[PDB]
Amino acid sequence: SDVGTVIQVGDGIARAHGLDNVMSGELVEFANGVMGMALNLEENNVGIVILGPYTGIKEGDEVRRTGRIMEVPVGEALIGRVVNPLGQPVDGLGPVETTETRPIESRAPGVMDRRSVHEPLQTGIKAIDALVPIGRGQRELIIGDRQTGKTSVAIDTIINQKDQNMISIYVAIGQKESTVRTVVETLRKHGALDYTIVVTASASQPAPLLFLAPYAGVAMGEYFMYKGKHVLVVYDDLSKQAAAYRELSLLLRRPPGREAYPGDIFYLHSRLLERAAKLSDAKGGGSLTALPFVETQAGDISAYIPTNVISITDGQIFLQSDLFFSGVRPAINAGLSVSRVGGAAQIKAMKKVAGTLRLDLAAYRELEAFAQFGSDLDKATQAKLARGARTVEVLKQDLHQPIPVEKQVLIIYALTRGFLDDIPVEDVRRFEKEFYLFLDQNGQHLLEHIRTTKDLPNEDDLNKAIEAFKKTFVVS
Amino acid sequence: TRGRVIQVMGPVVDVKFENGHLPAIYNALKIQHKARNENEVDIDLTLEVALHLGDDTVRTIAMASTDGLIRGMEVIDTGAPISVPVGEVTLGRVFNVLGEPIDLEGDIPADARRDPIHRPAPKFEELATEVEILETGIKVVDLLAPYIKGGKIGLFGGAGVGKTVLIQELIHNIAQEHGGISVFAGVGDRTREGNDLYHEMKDSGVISKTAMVFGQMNEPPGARMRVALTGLTMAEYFRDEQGQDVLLFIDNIFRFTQAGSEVSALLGRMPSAVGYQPTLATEMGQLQERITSTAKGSITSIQAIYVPADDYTDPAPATTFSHLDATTNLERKLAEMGIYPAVDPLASTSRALAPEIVGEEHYQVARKVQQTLQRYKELQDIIAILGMDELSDEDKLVVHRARRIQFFLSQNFHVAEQFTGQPGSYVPVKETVRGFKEILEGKYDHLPEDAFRLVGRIEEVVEKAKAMGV
Amino acid sequence: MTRGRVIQVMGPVVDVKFENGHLPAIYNALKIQHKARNENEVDIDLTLEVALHLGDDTVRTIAMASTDGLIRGMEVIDTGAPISVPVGEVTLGRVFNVLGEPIDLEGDIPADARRDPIHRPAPKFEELATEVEILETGIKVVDLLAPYIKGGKIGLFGGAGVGKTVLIQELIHNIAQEHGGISVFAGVGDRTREGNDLYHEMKDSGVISKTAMVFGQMNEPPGARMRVALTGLTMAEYFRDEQGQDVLLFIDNIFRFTQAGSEVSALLGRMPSAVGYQPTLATEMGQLQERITSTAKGSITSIQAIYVPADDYTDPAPATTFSHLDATTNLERKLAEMGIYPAVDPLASTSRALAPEIVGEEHYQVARKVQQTLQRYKELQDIIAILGMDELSDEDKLVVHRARRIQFFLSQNFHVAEQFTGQPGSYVPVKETVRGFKEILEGKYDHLPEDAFRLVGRIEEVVEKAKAMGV
Ligand SMILES: Nc1ncnc2c1ncn2[C@@H]1O[C@H](COP(=O)(O)OP(=O)(O)OP(=O)(O)O)[C@@H](O)[C@H]1O
Ligand SMILES: Nc1ncnc2c1ncn2[C@@H]1O[C@H](COP(=O)(O)OP(=O)(O)OP(=O)(O)O)[C@@H](O)[C@H]1O
Ligand SMILES: Nc1ncnc2c1ncn2[C@@H]1O[C@H](COP(=O)(O)OP(=O)(O)O)[C@@H](O)[C@H]1O
Ligand SMILES: [Mg+2]
Ligand SMILES: [Mg+2]
Ligand SMILES: [Mg+2]
């Protein structure tokens, strides 16, 4: 029958006898009162990963079968709270009235149901919005070494979504719980926390809660997409999820593979990452863009988790530690970062200026890689080296200060059309500062045409605006 | 005589058939179940047999997710391999690995014949070796690495270099050139590109004489592995009965090798090299050897490969390299330079660039082009760091023509209609080879280098300059 | 029947067979009292910790002292609770073994003392606090590039022989005199020599009155080494909760907790991972590290050291623990061999406290501009090896020029160094540090010889050295 006896309790795992009618991924409840996710249905004993604290359980205890399958609470009530993957509040502020529940595991949308990705996801980060564009429905990896800028870029994304509709989410896996608190207070201080949900599994939590955290986060995101509102999901580190799977599988005595990761890993991540979509007008016009992050060890590449995820995602951003400590922030290598969707997502004004900027920076990347060591070169190369140095200095940016797209296109246009030759490389971060103030003191009609039209203003008036500012600005 | 499930371990399952009734290896199995109680979940799932075990038990792999599988479910035995419907009916349709149509257009009747996925390869007696240059209408491929019917062709690159854009331009140009059947397999393809390609081929109206097979990345690994062989069994019907040249396209086989590695690890075998399974060359050969030119006709194939980190000694590329007749290498530096399809002139090789196969003039033209670009590749750093006026006037001539050659290997494309909107066009072989004879002669050296990008004829280059007024 | 029998021994591990219905919970503790009955045997008192059940009433257990002598069929008793530490006011000034018995010769703890479990769940998200401010500590580099955090985890990472314990002893000499709070010092994977040297250092300065101490040593079996970290932490936890004082915790080497797990895990019976480590690396290390938290009730600052197993940081045990630490110091061998002490990696030192809000603009600009010059110097070292110094110009000439001087001026004479070398030590205020590195970056003192900048406190001392060398 459907009540069984436990016969191991080691290490955060159990084994049990009986439970004839059990199912893979079912919930089963212990006499202590916490419940477990059945995950190997072997020949005579059921493997039972345990959620919550496991110290109380002893052999000879009984497990009852809940009959339910894994489900997440969903509603409009969650927006503005910090919540546990099983669905409980952990923030104070009391219980949340979640009207209904969705399954954790379910089929994604078919090939016909989707549409092409044609509307942007403006982030406010000049080097991304210009050179590695994101469109709503796109899935894009950010991969870099530790302390390079994964969470700062995530938070700049969630902060910029105040101006355009986005029911954003943020999932923290394995994190130090005081860092999560510093993040949440940063989202509160920048006035941004009331339209977003934060899901927390801290490092202390038992292994399955780290493992199930992104599956429940996306289960929360897709309800809003079915209603028809745009959504954004961020997973703060997928690699820690993969490690929780490894440790869980090794304790279950499953045949291992490369490193020791179980062979299922690529399927497990594809089950997570292919729910992201852009549904058709017949299905409501929604979106679910996703931004997973992977931490690479020492600039490692061709390893098992990074190559899996790099094969799944429709683009990748690679961050370089040696760039960061050289003053480029957020540090982004244009040479190794690609977006297959790119070009289509951008606004038409951006498409004209950002397409040429890619050509300029690629040409100088190669010329500088070899010819910078020699002191003096050919004139035409000294010019292209000057344009590349100004390009990287003009793409440096501050922390938690998103720039609206209207004033991005006007600075990139000023850069590509070569208005910045007179100004020195050190003074540029001040040329930007004094120019954006001037652009709110004068030129409001330019920005208004760009805001709704998505279109570059008449070139006579744009040049008149930049030439007047270059009258005002004082060179060191 | 129906089996019972006895273990579940993710994709892998075990079934204890009553002895005397065991299936063969690579046989197929059905589970259909409707839930007796509220707690249970309805399931429709198929398994394939992958090895036998110690007593009665058989070890199997699952083509849909095993969530909700009880222990002691009934398994039906089909007594045969996975059976794919074959006929003219499949023209225009989109199928899953098991032969059901994914698109909502309709459902194939039960009454039709279906052919097994697994069948022995062409024998030594039956094989033949005809040689004909395949006019693809792509100015780099036709000039510098001529394709040939009957053979496996390869496209090697990293990520985001043009492999899919180029495969679309192939499918479109071949659909204009001949009413020869095409079969396209998206093996482990992102569900996003499947929407892009299905709608592009429906909207240009290229789909009337083609079929499509998909298996997405969110499929189990076994279902990713068996999708390439479904495409093979369809292309094999069209060659054997209709007796005409039937192209088979495979979108990227790197995912196929990795799906095999993951299946071996699930089966509990021991890795090798960079973790690829023991049986790497065997499985890939089994696939690749059916692509042939026996006496009825052809199944020439064009395949693309992801090279993980610009080092080509990884087992999946290295094991692939022996089978392929002609290979063109795609490099990201040219794609970012904005000249397309990004194919390296120096690194591309084919068997067919010999006067007995291609032609006398074609041999002399192609070798002059490659010598010109090789001499340019070793002259750029002197141009960068000495004064460019220091280059000798003969080397200055090689520079000027290498600039034009490098641009005029670019071509305007029908697939660019989505990304940039321009019309593009198709170029027959004679006009490619003559136009390069015009480039190398040098009377046209006065026309400016910017004109040469994204054109299909030297008359187009005269027109584009004419707009500039030159 | 609550008495058991040993059935198998396998080194550190022992397997008991309790009768049915009395299996102890995980993390409980068991006692061995055995009369040496015959001329062949050896008497022992040993205690065992339960670590898994294994069916048919068997439980697998880690011994806390060497298993030399145990016999099949010898009895085991059950305490009923975790390894129980006596805590309260009387702990200060005492030294304990891992089990909570004093070893200091002074006496034994009154039996009336409340004694507490070592295993309990970590503090929750509502309880934490994040008001972040500088634990100003006078170590010139740590006061510049990676400012330590009051109430925050601090980490020292280095290979064997680079200079972690000398840094901890300078930290105790600077902080523990003025902190005004209970200090707990726990030795995990500790040399017995350094334990004696510290106990005499604390008595000679009188500091021993406020602090309490727990020791395990390199010569201990692995179970003792693991459970010393937890016994030390339970003391610091009581003082910050009940008394509410700020507390200072030191753990001597926390890597040996994970390594001892690596030893005893394979015998327990669970497959290797990425380089022989147990499966449960990150969950059990995170379980310990998530307890060491500054709740609203009262702050802990904790300073830890971690031995990288080789000079390789990509190893699993360093990799899992780089996440948990607010401010991290990387000690690298290559600098130490040049004679620069403490050997701190300027480029790889990371701390949350660096942020214009927390340090202020004057201090921030300088931390980043100094890291920028040293990163450019790494790039120039390669090209000068090919072409030479004579080929560099302008911005590349002055980076090598200033990066030599900065690399030397981050070296300081510690007040604890006076035993290894004849020198007197120093304490440097933050303002003198930020002015000093600013002055070097401006180039006001560029004429002084690069020899002078080594092992020095302030720019005035460098001018005095350079004057004696004939400037
Ligand atoms: N745009 C930026 N300009 C300057 N400094 C930045 C920028 N973005 C991030 N930083 C700096 O990055 C450091 C911390 O990086 P961050 O908080 O993003 O952690 P991380 O690099 O994502 O690593 P982890 O994932 O472990 O948190 C701080 O010094 C912060 O000031
Ligand atoms: N500030 C300093 N000034 C002078 N010498 C120093 C300084 N710091 C370390 N040393 C020297 O370097 C070595 C540091 O010894 P230390 O006890 O710190 O080793 P360790 O790194 O702690 O070893 P372990 O990791 O095994 O504990 C000794 O030779 C010591 O004299
Ligand atoms: N002729 C072209 N004109 C404009 N953009 C192009 C052209 N060819 C390729 N691209 C751009 O480069 C991308 C190449 O990606 P693609 O090779 O399709 O990726 P994958 O092979 O992974 O599907 C295209 O998605 C498009 O954004
Ligand atoms: Mg992080
Ligand atoms: Mg592709
Ligand atoms: Mg030491």
C347 CB neighbour count, 10 Å cutoff = 18
Residues B66 and B97 grouped into a single domain: no
CA gap B278, B299 in Å, rounded: 29
B146 preceded by a cis bond (ω within 30 of 0): no
| Nearest ligand atom owner, CA of A314 | 3
Strand order in the sheet with C327-331: C95-96, C212-217, C183-190, C247-251, C300-307, C153-158, C327-331, C350-351
CA gap A396, B150 in Å, rounded: 54
Pair B247, B153: CB distance under 8 Å: no
What are the CA-CA distances from residue B103 to residues A281, A349, B90, B107, C441 (Å)? 18, 37, 12, 9, 68
What are the CA-CA distances from residue A36 to residues A60, A67, A213 (Å)? 16, 12, 15
B58 CB neighbour count, 10 Å cutoff = 24
Residues 6+ positions from A261 with CB-CB distance below 8 Å: A242, A245, A246, A304, A305
Q: Do chains A and C touch (3 or more CB pairs under 8 A)?
A: yes
Residues B414 and B319 grouped into a single domain: no
Residues B71 and B94 grouped into a single domain: no
DSSP single-letter state for residue C298 = B
CA gap A39, A25 in Å, rounded: 6
- Helix ranges (H only) for A205-338 are 207-211, 213-227, 238-251, 265-273, 304-312, 321-324
Method: cryo-EM
Q: Do chains B and A touch (3 or more CB pairs under 8 A)?
A: yes
The domain boundary, picked from C319, C352, C385, lies at C352
Ligand 1: distance of its center to the CA of C352 in Å? 9
Residues B118 and B253 grouped into a single domain: yes
Taking alpha carbons only, the member of A130, A190, A200, A131 closest to residue A161 is A190
Distance, in angstroms, between A346 CA and closest chain B CA?
A: 12
- Which residues of B are annotated as part of the binding site for ADP? 160-165, 340
CA gap A386, A418 in Å, rounded: 11
SS3 of chain B: the string is CCEEEEEEECCEEEEECCCCCCCCCCEEEEEEECCCCCCCCCEEEEEEEEEECCCCEEEEEECCCCCCCCCCCEEEEEEEECEEECCCCCCCCEECCCCCECCCCCCCCCCCCEEECCCCCCCCCCECCCCCECCCCCHHHHHHCCCECCCEEEEEECCCCCHHHHHHHHHHHHHHHCCCCEEEEEEEECHHHHHHHHHHHHHCCCCCCCEEEEEECCCCHHHHHHHHHHHHHHHHHHHHHHCCCCEEEECCCHHHHHHHHHHHHHHCCCCECCCECCCHHHHHHHHHHCCCCECCCCCCEEEEEECCCCCCCCHHHHHHHCCCCEEEECCHHHHHCCCCCCCCCCCCEECCCCCCCCCHHHHHHHHHHHHHHHHHHCCHHHHHHCCHHHCCHHHHHHHHHHHHHHHHCCCCCCCHHHHCCCCCCCCCHHHHHHHHHHHHHCHHHHCCHHHHCCCCCHHHHHHHHHHHCC
CA gap C85, C113 in Å, rounded: 10
CA gap B217, A139 in Å, rounded: 14
Residues C264 and C405 grouped into a single domain: no
Which SS3 state, helix, strand or coil, does residue A208 take? Answer: helix
Q: Are strands B247-250 and B301-306 parallel, antiparallel or unpaired?
A: parallel
CA gap C390, C374 in Å, rounded: 20
Query: Phi and psi dihedrals of A291, rounded to 5?
Result: -125, 80
In chain B, the number of structural domains is 3
Q: Are strands A289-295 and A231-235 parallel, antiparallel or unpaired?
A: parallel
Which SS3 state, helix, strand or coil, does residue A51 take? Answer: coil
User: Which residues on neighbouring strands pair with residue C9, listed in sequence order?
Assistant: C14
Residues 6+ positions from A124 with CB-CB distance below 8 Å: A156, A159, A160, A402, A403, A404, A405
Q: Among all residues of chain A, which has the CA nearest to that of B308?
A: A302
Taking alpha carbons only, the member of A277, A266, A260 closest to residue A238 is A266
CA gap A219, A102 in Å, rounded: 7
CA gap A206, A185 in Å, rounded: 26
Cα dihedral sign for A204, A208, A209, A210?
positive
Work out the widest C-alpha separation in chain B, in whole angstroms. 88
Report, as residue numbers or ranges, the catalytic residues of A: 340
User: Which residues on neighbouring strands pair with residue B447, listed in sequence order?
Assistant: none
Residues B368 and B418 grouped into a single domain: yes
Pair A200, A76: CB distance under 8 Å: no
Nearest to A274 among B217, B221, B275 (CB): B217
Pair B329, B144: CB distance under 8 Å: no
Interface contact C273-A10, CB threshold 8 A: no
Residues B129 and B254 grouped into a single domain: yes
Write out the two tokens for A84.
């546990």
Residues C120 and C228 grouped into a single domain: yes
Contacts of A340 in chain B (CB under 8 A): 160
A280 is in an annotated binding site: no
Protein residues within 5 Å, CB atom, of ion ligand 4: A 151
CA gap A271, C167 in Å, rounded: 49
Residues B195 and B284 grouped into a single domain: yes
Interface contact C126-A178, CB threshold 8 A: no
C291 CB neighbour count, 10 Å cutoff = 19
Q: Which residues of C318-340 are buried (b: 16+ CB within 10 A; e: fewer)?
A: bbbbbbbbbbbbbbbeebbeeeb
Chain centroid to CA B107: 27
CA gap C370, C387 in Å, rounded: 26
C261 CB neighbour count, 10 Å cutoff = 22
Ligand 5: distance of its center to the CA of A139 in Å? 14
Contacts of A135 in chain B (CB under 8 A): none
Interface test with A, best of B67, B95, B192 (most A CBs within 10 A): B192
Pair B129, B422: CB distance under 8 Å: no
What are the CA-CA distances from residue C211 to residues A249, B85, C112, C228 (Å)? 44, 81, 21, 16
CA gap B313, B69 in Å, rounded: 42
- For B140, the domain range is 83-351
Residues 6+ positions from A417 with CB-CB distance below 8 Å: none
Amino acid symbol at B20: G
Contacts of A267 in chain B (CB under 8 A): 10-11, 218, 220-221, 262
CA gap B110, A137 in Å, rounded: 38
Q: Does A12 touch chain C (CB under 8 A)?
A: yes
CA angle A132, A134, A135 (to 5 degrees): 145
Taking alpha carbons only, the member of C188, C180, C305 closest to residue C247 is C180
Nearest-atom index, ligand 1, CA of A151: 22
Pair A150, A142: CB distance under 8 Å: yes
Pair B81, B25: CB distance under 8 Å: no
| Nearest ligand atom owner, CA of C194 | 6
The domain boundary, picked from C22, C48, C82, lies at C82
DSSP single-letter state for residue C310 = S
User: Does residue B214 have its Cβ closer than 6 Å to ligand 3?
Assistant: no
Which SS3 state, helix, strand or coil, does residue C14 take? Answer: strand
C184 CB neighbour count, 10 Å cutoff = 26
Interface contact B262-A340, CB threshold 8 A: no
CA gap A230, B221 in Å, rounded: 31
Pair B7, A42: CB distance under 8 Å: yes
Which SS3 state, helix, strand or coil, does residue A338 take? Answer: strand
The domain boundary, picked from B321, B351, B381, lies at B351
CA gyration radius, chain B:
26
Amino acid symbol at C233: L
Which SS3 state, helix, strand or coil, does residue A15 take? Answer: strand
Residues B4 and B92 grouped into a single domain: no
Query: Phi and psi dihedrals of C280, rounded to 5?
Result: -75, 60
B428 preceded by a cis bond (ω within 30 of 0): no
Interface contact C280-A251, CB threshold 8 A: yes
Concatenated DSSP letters for A61-115? -EEEEEEEE-EEEE-STTTT-EE-TTS-B-SSS------EEEESS-PPP-TTTB-
What are the CA-CA distances from residue C228 to residues C103, C190, C318 (Å)? 14, 11, 20
Taking alpha carbons only, the member of B2, B119, B97 closest to residue B58 is B2
Chain centroid to CA B415: 17
Cα dihedral sign for C67, C68, C71, C77?
negative
CA gap A23, B33 in Å, rounded: 14
CA angle C334, C338, C342 (to 5 degrees): 80
CA gyration radius, chain C:
26
CA gap B396, A72 in Å, rounded: 70
Which SS3 state, helix, strand or coil, does residue A176 take? Answer: coil
Residues B296 and B243 grouped into a single domain: yes
A101 CB neighbour count, 10 Å cutoff = 15
Residues B311 and B430 grouped into a single domain: no
CA gap B297, B128 in Å, rounded: 10
CA gyration radius, chain A:
26
Write out the two tokens for C230.
């937890």
